[PDB]
Amino acid sequence: NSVSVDLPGSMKVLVSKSSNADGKYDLIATVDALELSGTSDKNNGSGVLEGVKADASKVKLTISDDLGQTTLEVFKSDGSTLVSKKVTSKDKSVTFEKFNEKGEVSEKIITRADGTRLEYTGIKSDGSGKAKEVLKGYVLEGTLTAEKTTLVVKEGTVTLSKNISKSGAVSVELNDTDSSAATKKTAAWNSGTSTLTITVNSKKTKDLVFTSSNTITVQQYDSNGTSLEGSAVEITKLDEIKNALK
């Protein structure tokens, strides 16, 4: 009788074919063996369903009115304090949070639509913590504060810092403690093209592009230091990034 509705977050909800005397629709779903049920004033599969884990934790699935977003929450057995929350947004990106006993977020894992991830762990009450960015083929590691995420790669005396601000803006900087003017790397950041240009001995040597696809590419300049040569190469492993910093 009911109608199966496909949901963000690899879930399904069954909605009754017709409404009850109050005009409301019955909803049922099964999420990892847990039976959830609810009632809704819409007919499309949107609304709230509830159930319990085997350990008595409360579970709530909230489906937005237009089916674009789902939120799967686990609470303590009294339903008061959050334990975890998984939000699948309409781009199919996912935010997964764990909470401590005061309902404060202690872990946040963001999975972008392309599968790359930001992993924030050991989050404290000031919003500081440890940070990792999980890319295709490699991981970047660093820290989180309420101002920015800073991911760091070191090679020789060079430190490359990729910053993701609280607003999401990317900026990259390079600092080299080599004081020899012949070998010291410096770099300039172009926000318009998300490109870091490295210079050595007053000549541009390479462009590192931090793409909207969450990749990094590297392209060398000619010996003239003015024209790019060849074509940009996508970084596939951490060892590659280090090579570009030599």
Q: 238 and 156, same structural domain?
A: yes
Task: Please tell me what DSSP assigns to residue 22.
Answer: T
Could you write out the DSSP letters of every residue in 175-230?
EE----TTT-EEEEEETTTTEEEEEETTEEEEEEEE-TTS-EEEEEBPTTSSSB-S
Q: 125 and 89, same structural domain?
A: no
What are the tokens at 4? Answer: 């199966």
Domain with residue 33: its CATH number is 2.40.128.160
From 79, 99, 119, the end of a domain falls on 99
* Cα→Cα distances 204→167, 181, 224, Å: 30, 14, 8
Comparing CA positions, the residue from 130, 94, 140, 96 lying closest to residue 115 is 94
From 39, 68, 99, the end of a domain falls on 99
Could you write out the DSSP letters of every residue in 133-152?
EEETTEEEEEEE-SSEEEEE
CA-based max dimension of the chain: 83
Q: 144 and 71, same structural domain?
A: no
Comparing CA positions, the residue from 33, 71, 245 lying closest to residue 158 is 245
Q: At which residue do the structure tokens 């900026």 appear?
A: 171
From 99, 134, 149, the end of a domain falls on 99
Q: 70 and 130, same structural domain?
A: no
Q: Which amino acid is at 216?
A: I
Q: 108 and 95, same structural domain?
A: no
What resolution in Å is listed for this PDB structure? 1.4
Question: In b/e form, how buried is each residue of 100-133, taking b as 16+ CB within 10 angstroms?
Answer: eeeeebbbbbbbeeeebbbbbeebeeeeebebbb
What are the tokens at 101? Answer: 């006993």
What are the tokens at 50? Answer: 């509830």
Q: 133 and 24, same structural domain?
A: no
Comparing CA positions, the residue from 171, 180, 225, 177 lying closest to residue 198 is 225
Say how many CA atoms lie within 13 Å of 25 toward its Cβ: 21
Q: 80 and 23, same structural domain?
A: yes
Task: Please tell me what DSSP assigns to residue 240.
Answer: H
Distance of alpha carbon 104 from alpha carbon 90, whole angstroms:
25
Query: Kind of pairing, strands 129-135 and 138-144?
Result: antiparallel
Count the domains in the chain.
Answer: 2
Q: 209 and 87, same structural domain?
A: no
Q: 189 and 89, same structural domain?
A: no
Q: 220 and 131, same structural domain?
A: yes
Q: Which structural domain range is residue 201 located in?
A: 104-246
Q: At which residue do the structure tokens 């303590």 appear?
A: 76
Number of helical H runs and strand E runs in the chain: 1, 21
Domain with residue 145: its CATH number is 3.90.930.1
Query: Kind of pairing, strands 148-155 and 158-165?
Result: antiparallel
Q: 211 and 114, same structural domain?
A: yes
Q: 77 and 15, same structural domain?
A: yes
CA 166, distance to chain mean position in Å, is 13
Contact 34, 56 (CB under 8 A): no
